[PDB]
Amino acid sequence: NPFIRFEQDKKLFRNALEVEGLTKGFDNGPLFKNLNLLLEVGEKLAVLGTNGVGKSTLLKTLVGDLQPDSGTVKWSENARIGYYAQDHEYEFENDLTVFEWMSQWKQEGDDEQAVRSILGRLLFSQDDIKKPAKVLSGGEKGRMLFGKLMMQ
Amino acid sequence: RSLKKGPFIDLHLLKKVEKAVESGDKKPLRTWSRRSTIFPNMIGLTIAVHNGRQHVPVFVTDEMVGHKLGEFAPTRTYR
Amino acid sequence: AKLHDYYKDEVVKKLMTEFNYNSVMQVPRVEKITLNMGVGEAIADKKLLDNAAADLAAISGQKPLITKARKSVAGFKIRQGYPIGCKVTLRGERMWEFFERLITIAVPRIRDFRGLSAKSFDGRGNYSMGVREQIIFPEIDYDKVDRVRGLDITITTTAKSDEEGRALLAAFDFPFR
Amino acid sequence: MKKDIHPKYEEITASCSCGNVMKIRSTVGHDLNLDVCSKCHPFFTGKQRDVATGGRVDRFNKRFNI
Amino acid sequence: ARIAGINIPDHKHAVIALTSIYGVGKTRSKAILAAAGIAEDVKISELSEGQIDTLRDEVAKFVVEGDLRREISMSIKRLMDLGCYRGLRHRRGLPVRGQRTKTNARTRKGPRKP
RNA sequence: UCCUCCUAAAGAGUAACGGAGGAGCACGAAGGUUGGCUAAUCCUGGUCGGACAUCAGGAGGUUAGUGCAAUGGCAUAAGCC
RNA sequence: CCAGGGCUACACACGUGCUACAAUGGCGCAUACAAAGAGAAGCGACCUCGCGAGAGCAAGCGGACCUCAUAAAGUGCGUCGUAGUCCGGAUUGGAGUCUGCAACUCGACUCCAUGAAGUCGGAAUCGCUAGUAAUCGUGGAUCAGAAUGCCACGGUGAAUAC
Ligand SMILES: Nc1ncnc2c1ncn2[C@@H]1O[C@H](COP(=O)(O)OP(=O)(O)OP(=O)(O)O)[C@@H](O)[C@H]1O
Numbered sequence: 001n002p003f004i005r006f007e008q009d010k011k012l013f014r015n016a017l018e019v020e021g022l023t024k025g026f027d028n029g030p031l032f033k034n035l036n037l038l039l040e041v042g043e044k045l046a047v048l049g050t051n052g053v054g055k056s057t058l059l060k061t062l063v064g065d066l067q068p069d070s071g072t073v074k075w076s077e078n079a080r081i082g083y084y085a086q087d088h089e090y091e092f093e094n095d096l097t098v099f100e101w102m103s104q105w106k107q108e109g110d111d112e113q114a115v116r117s118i119l120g121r122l123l124f125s126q127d128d129i130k131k132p133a134k135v136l137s138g139g140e141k142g143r144m145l146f147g148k149l150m151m152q
Numbered sequence: 153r154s155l156k157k158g159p160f161i162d163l164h165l166l167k168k169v170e171k172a173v174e175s176g177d178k179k180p181l182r183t184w185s186r187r188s189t190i191f192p193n194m195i196g197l198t199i200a201v202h203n204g205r206q207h208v209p210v211f212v213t214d215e216m217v218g219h220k221l222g223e224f225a226p227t228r229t230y231r
Numbered sequence: 232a233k234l235h236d237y238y239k240d241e242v243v244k245k246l247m248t249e250f251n252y253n254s255v256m257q258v259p260r261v262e263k264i265t266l267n268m269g270v271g272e273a274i275a276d277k278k279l280l281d282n283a284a285a286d287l288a289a290i291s292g293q294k295p296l297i298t299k300a301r302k303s304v305a306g307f308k309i310r311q312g313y314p315i316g317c318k319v320t321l322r323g324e325r326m327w328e329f330f331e332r333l334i335t336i337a338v339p340r341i342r343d344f345r346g347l348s349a350k351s352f353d354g355r356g357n358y359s360m361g362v363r364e365q366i367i368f369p370e371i372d373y374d375k376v377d378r379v380r381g382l383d384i385t386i387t388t389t390a391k392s393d394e395e396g397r398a399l400l401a402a403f404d405f406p407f408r
Numbered sequence: 409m410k411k412d413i414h415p416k417y418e419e420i421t422a423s424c425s426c427g428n429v430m431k432i433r434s435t436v437g438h439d440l441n442l443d444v445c446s447k448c449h450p451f452f453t454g455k456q457r458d459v460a461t462g463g464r465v466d467r468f469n470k471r472f473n474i
Numbered sequence: 475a476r477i478a479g480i481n482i483p484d485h486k487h488a489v490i491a492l493t494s495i496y497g498v499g500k501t502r503s504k505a506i507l508a509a510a511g512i513a514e515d516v517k518i519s520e521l522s523e524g525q526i527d528t529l530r531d532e533v534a535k536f537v538v539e540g541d542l543r544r545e546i547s548m549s550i551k552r553l554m555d556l557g558c559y560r561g562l563r564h565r566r567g568l569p570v571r572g573q574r575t576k577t578n579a580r581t582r583k584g585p586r587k588p
Numbered sequence: 589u590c591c592u593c594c595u596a597a598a599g600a601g602u603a604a605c606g607g608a609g610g611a612g613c614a615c616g617a618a619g620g621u622u623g624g625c626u627a628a629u630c631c632u633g634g635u636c637g638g639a640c641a642u643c644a645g646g647a648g649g650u651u652a653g654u655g656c657a658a659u660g661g662c663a664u665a666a667g668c669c
Numbered sequence: 670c671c672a673g674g675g676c677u678a679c680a681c682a683c684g685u686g687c688u689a690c691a692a693u694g695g696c697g698c699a700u701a702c703a704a705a706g707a708g709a710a711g712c713g714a715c716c717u718c719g720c721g722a723g724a725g726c727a728a729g730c731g732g733a734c735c736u737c738a739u740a741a742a743g744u745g746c747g748u749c750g751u752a753g754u755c756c757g758g759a760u761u762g763g764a765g766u767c768u769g770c771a772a773c774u775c776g777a778c779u780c781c782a783u784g785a786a787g788u789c790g791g792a793a794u795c796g797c798u799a800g801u802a803a804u805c806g807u808g809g810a811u812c813a814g815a816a817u818g819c820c821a822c823g824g825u826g827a828a829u830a831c
């Protein structure tokens with residue numbers, strides 16, 4: 001059982017998005033029409049659907065990988081957004097080892113502790129922190145992304 | 153702070169100081185006045201200020217002109 | 232080098248006249264400059280050493296050599312081989328360029344300047360100085376850096392004695408007292 | 409040198425706040441205009457104006473308008 | 475967007491931008507805009523650079539962030555070493571303007587400690 | 589069971605429930621070769637820096653070092669790249 | 670009898686209030702609607718000077734006539750567009766005014782600068798049934814000066830009580 005606990009560097013007070021309209025439909029009829037909603041610093045909002053409804057593209061247009069055809073989103077200017085993307089293969093590239101990968105993050109931290117400790121707190125070892133991070137598989141990559149979230 | 157004019161100090165202080173400056177540096181000046189500010193002519197003296205039970209001697213340096221004689225005698229103690 | 236030409240055209244004759252020398256090669260001459268800084272904090276983070284190396288590579292047009300600990304000590308909890316300091320050696324043309332671009336612009340820029348100490352020789356004609364602020368050099372623009380990390384300048388000269396070193400450096404209008 | 413292991417090094421033309429144009433080969437990539445150089449630094453003029461802080465005995469006599 | 479220390483704030487009206495300077499409040503800032511010939515309601519981005527140089531010279535006549543730090547710090551350092559009553563409160567860490575310390579004065583004493 | 593020093597009486601060997609310590613490994617380089625280099629500890633100067641981190645000068649000279657206990661040895665280095 | 674000092678001392682705990690955490694809010698400009706009361710070593714117009722506290726000259730009033738004394742929330746217009754902010758005002762430095770022989774311990778107020786904690790508050794606890802609660806101002810008692818206290822006056826003005 002790994003020990004993961006995402007903290008908060010700064011607390012947000014009023015709201016996050018206040019989204020009004022996106023009008024986002026790739027090629028066919030838009031999978032959603034209006035989608036005007038707020039958060040008031042809410043929680044969860046577990047979007048669900050079948051295989052092919054558009055949750056991931058909605059999230060991409062929400063974060064900024066893509067943008068809506070017409071409308072705006074706008075975040076709170078003090079926010080900090082972590083993203084566990086649907087696909088994580090564009091991240092694990094360029095022949096970076098585990099240690100270098102998880103050290104490329106961090107704001108003001110030490111390159112020996114809090115980057116080599118955040119790894120040990122989730123089922124990783126001295127042997128692990130030296131193998132290339134590209135040859136990891138599945139749950140290891142997911143835990144790497146969770147570690148990046150905790151670090152950020 | 154106080155008023156426009158007339159920095160108020162007591163006669164029984166200026167008169168004592170005038171004889172003190174004439175002779176030169178001497179014994180401490182024993183006074184019971186705390187409400188009299190410090191004029192430029194009193195530098196180099198050793199006036200003593202009443203604190204409620206005794207007199208603590210004080211030597212007038214260059215910066216001690218804008219405050220009265222009672223501003224350099226802590227009137228009560230701590231610890 | 233403007234300072235090299237100034238040396239060989241004025242300082243040689245000035246020093247021979249002032250000191251009653253027999254040979255033109257008896258005159259004290261500056262032979263090298265050394266810029267270093269032992270970061271110390273690199274124990275728990277190696278990237279700070281690389282940042283320091285970039286700082287010195289900007290300050291002087293060379294690549295710093297990363298120097299390791301000579302012996303282990305438990306006072307500061309270091310071992311042998313740990314990279315601790317960075318150092319740059321300048322001789323000749325680049326040494327003259329750094330000398331000029333220090334003593335003509337960088338020295339005035341230091342906050343609250345009064346004059347470099349004259350009693351800071353090692354009794355053998357050499358000189359040493361600390362800057363305490365890496366941002367007085369124009370190569371650093373106060374936006375790239377993250378610290379106030381300082382540098383040590385060490386002027387190694389041929390001067391036989393500290394008095395001759397003082398005279399030689401005063402010939403270059405060094406900001407003494 | 410060692411065949412492109414060092415930063416770039418090209419001649420620049422820096423000037424003071426009163427002119428004093430100088431050519432110094434440095435690693436900046438663009439020239440700069442700065443404050444007084446060693447020529448114009450007031451470490452030999454305002455020395456008295458630097459060690460001058462103080463004064464209240466005279467500042468009371470101007471207050472003494474009587 | 476630059477003054478002596480930094481005029482970082484854009485999107486701010488002129489009279490409020492110079493308040494970011496350590497040494498300029500509101501009426502002192504109001505004298506900068508009115509005397510130098512700039513309207514109060516102008517947004518910083520819309521101004522030109524030429525007007526800034528007029529601003530930079532005008533503000534620099536005051537004592538500001540660069541030297542206002544020394545003015546207050548040395549003044550206290552005089553009283554601290556003066557032996558004056560007001561100095562002793564600065565030495566101890568108590569209110570100096572003759573106010574209550576029996577139950578209040580948390581601001582000078584910092585957060586409550588047992 | 590094996591290794592090192594003394595007892596061991598200046599060749600070798602030599603005992604006691606005599607006096608002191610170690611091993612049951614390690615290394616694909618920590619081996620071969622070629623090229624190069626020389627230590628500990630102190631003084632004076634130097635931003636944080638400190639009794640000792642990093643830099644420059646001097647004295648000293650192998651009192652350093654040797655993957656591992658001790659003896660012998662090592663500058664032509666057997667030590668460091 | 671007198672001079673100075675203390676009741677204003679502060680690691681801490683409690684009770685009663687005030688000011689705030691802001692957008693049904695701040696800031697600038699302009700304009701309406703009251704009531705009650707005090708004034709003789711006292712209230713003080715108007716005028717001028719001062720950025721402002723105030724200073725100089727100074728009529729009238731021992732008064733339904735004169736003064737204190739321009740009510741404030743409101744309304745209309747503009748900006749601020751959710752930040753420790755154009756909220757908040759503590760703390761502190763400098764220069765001031767006036768009372769009183771005297772403002773350091775220890776007054777009030779104004780000007781410039783600084784701008785903290787605080788982003789609806791744990792167990793628990795308090796007030797109120799109609800011009801009441803909530804909120805906004807005004808006056809007086811004591812008093813040379815010195816109240817967010819107390820005593821009184823008026824504006825706006827609710828929800829619910831099965
Ligand atoms: N590149 C694309 N081309 C065509 N259709 C797309 C594309 N990306 C998304 N979609 C459509 O958008 C719908 C919703 O997007 P999304 O990928 O989140 O769907 P999902 O199947 O619910 O999610 P996921 O499988 O990623 O967990 C999909 O069902 C699909 O029809």
Ligand SMILES: [Mg+2]
Pocket residue numbers: 596
């Ligand atoms: Mg034998």
Ligand SMILES: [Mg+2]
Pocket residue numbers: 597
């Ligand atoms: Mg024998």
Ligand SMILES: [Mg+2]
Pocket residue numbers: 602
């Ligand atoms: Mg035998």
Ligand SMILES: [Mg+2]
Pocket residue numbers: 618
């Ligand atoms: Mg070997």
Ligand SMILES: [Mg+2]
Pocket residue numbers: none
């Ligand atoms: Mg060899």
Ligand SMILES: [Mg+2]
Pocket residue numbers: none
């Ligand atoms: Mg070998």
Ligand SMILES: [Mg+2]
Pocket residue numbers: 676
């Ligand atoms: Mg009492």
Ligand code: NA
Pocket residue numbers: 054055056057086
């Ligand atoms: Na999806």
